[PDB]
Symmetry: C2
Subunit: 189 residues, 2 copies
């Protein structure tokens, strides 16, 4: 019933907090409280579980961006600030111990299976396209000046935001999120 | 080569942890790459954790020398010294096909799986880099390159937050594009 969901849940908690290299199937089963036979009913092996976890994180995180980026009661820049504020509230729930599954996996790329590279890049690119669209909308109402490139700016936002999450999880506090967003915010009029 | 055992260990450590990370790399893999016996490893280090801290101290020392080349070059304006550093760091990364990143960024990201000693050691190195960079930015203000408007410490912190994330992305994509993308956009903060 809840065998599959408990495995996904256990996987997302362990990979946002530690990363893939640190965690084996046995840790996962203890945390999920699910028999080994259920693990192998859903996934062929650890690498295949890893990919399922990437995909599940992408589906969840898309709903988070829906909530912020599609809130038409908010001017476009205020949507970006709602996003970073909500992302920080989510981190504060577990005292900043848990970061981004994608940034964690991204940093370990050298020890991951090759399949992972294109799946991680696809997810980062989906987010950048969405942020670029938000930034074009900020230009249309003069929140961001015409001499900026929305795509370049979207790529820089995600580069720095993952860097901010790395630092917040290292320091176990929100201050790096605030530094990043306060300085990046100066690209706007 | 018996007299080379310590450098071999550090070398193999730096190579393997900049390419993979701490959680991925066991002592046996280090020994096999260093071609030194186990008794030589334990002569110098009490365990993997003591080794890892020694690698951070080694990386701090060698990295400080690369910053010295850029940040202490008096033939360059302050902001040109910052562009030199990023150019150099990219050249370094390009030598090994962008497969090797920052040791401090790699370990920082896997902090949840590390002995708690590492936290202060990793944060210490980053704060050093940030202090050198803010000083660079204060000199950029004192000569008109940066507007009196900006906080040099906040900007130094935002630089190191963003640069570690650009390196992450360059090692993931195996290309310098995220580096150029980051610095191109960050360069707008300057006059």
């Amino acid at each position: 019933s809840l065998a599959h969901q408990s495995l996904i849940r256990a996987g997302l908690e362990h990979l946002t907090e530690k990363g893939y290299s640190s965690v084996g199937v046995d840790e996962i089963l203890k945390a999920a409280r699910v028999p080994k036979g259920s693990f192998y009913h859903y996934f062929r092996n650890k690498a295949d579980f890893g990919l399922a976890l990437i995909e599940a994180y992408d589906t969840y995180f898309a709903r988070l961006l829906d909530q912020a980026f599609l809130d038409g009661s908010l001017a476009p820049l205020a949507r970006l600030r709602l996003f970073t504020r909500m992302a920080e509230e989510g981190m504060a729930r577990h005292g900043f111990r848990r970061g981004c599954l994608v940034g964690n996996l991204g940093q370990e790329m050298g020890a991951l299976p090759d399949d992972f590279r294109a799946a991680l890049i696809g997810v980062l690119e989906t987010w950048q396209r969405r942020t670029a669209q938000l930034f074009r909308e900020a230009q249309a109402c003069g929140e961001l000046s015409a001499d900026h490139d929305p795509d370049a700016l979207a790529e820089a936002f995600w580069i720095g935001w993952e860097g901010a999450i790395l630092r917040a999880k290292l320091e176990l506090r929100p201050d790096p999120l605030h530094s990043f967003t306060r300085t990046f915010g100066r690209h706007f009029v």
